[PDB]
Design an enzyme around this catalytic site. Structure first.
Site, short mmCIF file in Angstrom:
data_model
loop_
_atom_site.label_atom_id
_atom_site.label_comp_id
_atom_site.label_asym_id
_atom_site.label_seq_id
_atom_site.Cartn_x
_atom_site.Cartn_y
_atom_site.Cartn_z
N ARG A 18 0.89 -1.19 0.20
CA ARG A 18 0.02 0.13 -0.01
C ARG A 18 0.85 1.22 0.23
O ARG A 18 0.60 2.19 -0.57
CB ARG A 18 -0.78 0.02 1.26
CG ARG A 18 -1.95 -0.92 0.95
CD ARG A 18 -2.59 -1.36 2.51
NE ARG A 18 -3.31 -0.22 3.10
CZ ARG A 18 -3.78 -0.25 4.21
NH1 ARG A 18 -3.92 -1.34 5.07
NH2 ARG A 18 -4.28 0.68 5.14
N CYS A 69 0.22 7.09 9.00
CA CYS A 69 -0.15 5.61 8.38
C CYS A 69 -1.30 5.74 7.57
O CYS A 69 -1.55 6.86 6.88
CB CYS A 69 -0.20 4.53 9.56
SG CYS A 69 -1.67 4.76 10.72
N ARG A 70 -2.53 4.73 7.81
CA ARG A 70 -3.72 5.14 7.19
C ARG A 70 -4.45 5.97 7.72
O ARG A 70 -5.34 6.89 7.01
CB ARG A 70 -4.54 3.91 6.93
CG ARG A 70 -6.01 3.49 6.56
CD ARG A 70 -6.46 4.52 5.48
NE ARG A 70 -7.75 4.35 5.32
CZ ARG A 70 -8.56 3.43 4.56
NH1 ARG A 70 -7.77 2.59 3.66
NH2 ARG A 70 -9.94 3.13 4.77
N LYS A 71 -4.70 5.77 9.16
CA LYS A 71 -5.81 6.56 9.72
C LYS A 71 -5.31 6.91 11.18
O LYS A 71 -5.96 7.41 12.24
CB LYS A 71 -6.80 5.69 9.99
CG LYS A 71 -6.61 4.49 10.65
CD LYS A 71 -7.93 3.53 10.84
CE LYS A 71 -8.58 3.07 9.62
NZ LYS A 71 -9.59 2.06 9.56
N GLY A 72 -3.75 7.06 11.43
CA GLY A 72 -3.31 7.22 12.61
C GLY A 72 -3.11 6.17 13.80
O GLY A 72 -2.81 6.78 15.24
N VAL A 73 -3.38 5.01 13.40
CA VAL A 73 -3.46 3.95 14.38
C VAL A 73 -1.92 3.33 14.37
O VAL A 73 -1.29 3.44 15.38
CB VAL A 73 -4.70 3.03 13.94
CG1 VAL A 73 -4.55 1.62 15.01
CG2 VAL A 73 -5.91 3.93 14.41
N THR A 74 -1.61 2.59 13.48
CA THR A 74 -0.33 1.75 13.26
C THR A 74 0.82 2.76 13.36
O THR A 74 1.87 2.31 13.74
CB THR A 74 -0.13 0.81 12.16
OG1 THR A 74 0.06 1.41 10.93
CG2 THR A 74 -1.55 -0.07 12.25
N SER A 85 -3.38 11.03 8.91
CA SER A 85 -2.69 10.35 8.17
C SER A 85 -3.20 10.31 6.52
O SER A 85 -3.81 11.20 6.05
CB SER A 85 -3.05 9.01 8.83
OG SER A 85 -1.70 8.42 9.64
#
Length: 293
Positions: free
Chosen positions: A186, A247-252, A274
């Site tokens: 990704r 990342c994608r949404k601030g989680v990983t 993100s």
């Protein structure tokens, strides 16, 4: 604002001895912060069936800014404070977060950073996750937890957060290293972004990629601090310099922050918006993709 670092990892052995000892209470609260993509596992039901005795469910779908168009954005100070208070957490509480991820960690680091970004240092993640708690035979229960309410005061620590505008400025200034924890495909643009409508994959120009699952061992435990340091160095990420995780949404991205913190660098900021926000707000000139496009 904090020089001596509070432990970010607690072992299953330690947590089990604490629960045996009767320590869960105002001084120690345990959270399952699991969240799964649509059509997969059922976070709340899993928690209802099997949780560490006395633990609560931390619902990330509730504890966020619901009015944002973007994914998993921080709630207001009040929203966080009201929610955590409702789980029996005060500013004196040691919060221990786990999740049910199959390797060993997915959402728990996000919740550890949420407490920190709201000024609370006494927070840790369960090393090995619920996966290892189960494998080792520690107690699980379906009994209901009903913590007495507490008062929490949240105070945003802006230094541990970055906005869209700050990441856009950074494209120009190059002041911070921007490190993206999404999987390699990704990040490069060869695999699509999931669970979204017309969202391309690719990455913000100038980024480095450090896929989050590389931080853990095959058993789901955090890699050692020597290991972690060697990973950043092999990625050309200089821990003595500023670093924003994305990342994608601030989680990983919060797994990069955790890894850096266990190497003595508490200062990594999370771009909460993100990729999901970036793609929707930034000129396409600011990102690249191998297809391409």
């Amino acid at each position: 604002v904090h020089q001596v670092l509070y432990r970010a990892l607690v072992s299953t052995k330690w947590l089990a001895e604490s629960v045996r000892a009767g320590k869960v209470g105002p001084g120690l609260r345990v959270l399952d912060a699991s969240w799964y993509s649509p059509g997969t596992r059922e976070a709340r039901k899993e928690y209802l069936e099997r949780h560490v005795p006395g633990a609560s469910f931390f619902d990330i779908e509730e504890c966020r800014d619901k009015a944002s168009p973007y994914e998993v954005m921080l709630p207001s100070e009040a929203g966080f404070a009201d929610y955590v208070g409702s789980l029996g957490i005060s500013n004196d509480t040691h919060v221990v977060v786990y999740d049910g991820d199959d390797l060993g960690s997915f959402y728990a680091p996000r919740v550890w950073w949420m407490f920190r970004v709201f000024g609370h240092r006494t927070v840790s993640v369960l090393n090995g996750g619920f996966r290892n708690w189960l494998k080792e035979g520690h107690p699980v229960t379906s009994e209901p937890s009903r913590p007495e309410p507490a008062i929490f005061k949240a105070t945003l620590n802006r230094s541990l957060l970055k906005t869209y505008e700050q990441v856009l400025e950074n494209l120009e200034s190059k002041r911070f290293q921007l490190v993206d924890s999404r999987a390699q495909g990704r990040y490069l643009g060869t695999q699509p972004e999931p669970d979204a409508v017309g969202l391309d994959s690719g990455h913000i120009r100038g980024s480095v990629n450090m896929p989050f699952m590389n931080f853990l061992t095959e058993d789901g435990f955090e890699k050692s601090p020597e290991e972690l340091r060697a990973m950043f160095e092999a990625k050309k990420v200089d821990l003595t310099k500023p670093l924003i995780a994305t990342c994608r949404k601030g989680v990983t991205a919060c797994h990069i922050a955790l890894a850096a913190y266990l190497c003595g660098k508490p200062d990594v900021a999370i771009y909460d918006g993100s990729w999901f926000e970036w793609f929707h707000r930034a000129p396409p000139e600011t990102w690249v993709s191998q297809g391409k496009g």
